[PDB]
Structure formats: C-alpha cells, structure tokens
Amino acid sequence: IIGGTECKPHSRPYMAYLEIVTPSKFCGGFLIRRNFVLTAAHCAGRSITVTLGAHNITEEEDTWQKLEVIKQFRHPKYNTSTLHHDIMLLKLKEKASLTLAVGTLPFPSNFVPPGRMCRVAGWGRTGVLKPGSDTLQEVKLRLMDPQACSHFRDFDHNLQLCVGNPRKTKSAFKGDSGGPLLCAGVAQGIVSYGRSDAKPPAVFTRISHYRPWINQILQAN
Amino acid sequence: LFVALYDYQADRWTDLSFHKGEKFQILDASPPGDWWEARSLTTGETGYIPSNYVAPV
C-alpha cells in the first residue's frame, strides 16, 4: 500500500497473505469461504502457503493460521498480454476456524460505477523503491472514469476497474496484488497491476464480471 | 533457460526490467500471451517478460 496507514490490527480479518513458490513470491488475497481464498491469477505457483490472522507479517502471533493451498483455480481465460481475467480461486487444505482476527468476507446472495470511494489493504511496498510493509497497510481510493486507465494495455471497463485518483500518490503497489478492493464494505475488485512508476490509477479486476465463474467453483467443490 | 538480446524497461509492475545479456529461468509459460513468467538470473527477480524479447542458450 502506497500512501496509506497501518491498519488497526486484525480489523481486516479477511486479509489473506500468500506465500508462493515455483523461488518464493508473495501476494495478498482474501477469505470468502472457510476453505476458499480469492486472489489474482499472476500469483499462481508450484505451491502456496496462506497466512491468516496476521497484522505484522514478520511477528508470529497466536491469531495466525497458516494453511496449505491444496487446489488452484486459475481463471482459464487468464491472458498475460492484457492481464485480463486476473482472478484465481484457492481451496485451502483445511476449513479455517472463525475467530476475531480471522473471518470470511461474504458476497451478497451489480455493476459498480466511477465516483465512489473504496479501500484496499496489503503488505506490499509503501513506495516504488521501498520494501514490502511488515504491517498490513490500507488506503482509501476513488473509482475513476475508465478513460483514466485508457493508456493501460487493452483496458476493458467490463472486466476491469480503474482505481485511484491520478492527482494523489495514494495507490496500490507491487505485492498488494490479490488483495480485495472493498467498496462500502463489499469486495468489488482485486488488485491486478499498475504502472511501474507507481502513478495511479491501477487496474483492479472487476469482481461482478466473474461472479458466476466463482459461484460455479464453490458449488462444484 | 533464456537470455536477453536487448535492454528492456517494463511498463507494468508485474513485469521485469532487464539488460542485454541478462538471463532467465522461466516459470509459468502456460498462460496464453506474448509474456512468460521468468526469474532473473541476474537480480533474482520474478515477473513476466516478452517472449519475442528473450532467447534460449
């Protein structure tokens, strides 16, 4: 999270932390079911460890729950030129235990417009040339006219959200990928990608679009 | 295992920058797209790269 503040610890009990190996790599995600994490497809990997209950990602706390992802549901449409369909589902090896510091973020039993504010949270870098944040950070961003992402490689306002005012620094950055964009407390987008120089807006996966692909998976599993 | 034939500064924070002569351990070449997931032998970094850009030894 570039230009945010550290969260109130465990205030975001859905926040998943992903540890992916092929080397190692790290992403965000969020918990939608007791055995499912929602993330992005460019995080896929040989094997992945999932830490839940964390605030400081380097301090082992008792709220923590590390679980082995035993299935990977990469969206089949996922394409690496446009980074369309940057969404992936993960079946955890074990149903997590719902506490205070660890909780699911349910989806209602709606296409979202530019204008509103939103929030995303993550342990990603807090600046272009900085390290990933030890502690979970968050930031409030605005939904933009998709002509604001116009110069993004094949931006599609139906598959993607254009998140973050260009007149601010506040933005999601590297490592924050897979983390939920929560609009008024509802997940509406997953951090996908953005500029190398960290200039906003960044491209978020439009949740609404893939909600059936999702419904299908959780049902058949 | 792949090499670089030209210097390259990526646009997306999902992709690697690299120089001529840099070398790469590819990782996920399955997704449909110009780009493969690789690992810099030079920086140790993981990210996507252009497949018309690199060359195998």
From Swiss-Prot, chain A:
CDD domains, alphabetized: Tryp_SPc
Record flagged with keyword Glycoprotein: yes
GO biological process, one term: midbrain development
Gene3D superfamilies: Trypsin-like serine proteases
Glycosylation sites (chain numbering): 56, 79
Residue intervals of the Peptidase S1 domain: 1-219
Role of this protein: Major secreted protease of mast cells with suspected roles in vasoactive peptide generation, extracellular matrix degradation, and regulation of gland secretion.
Sequence similarity: Belongs to the peptidase S1 family. Granzyme subfamily.
Protein name: Chymase
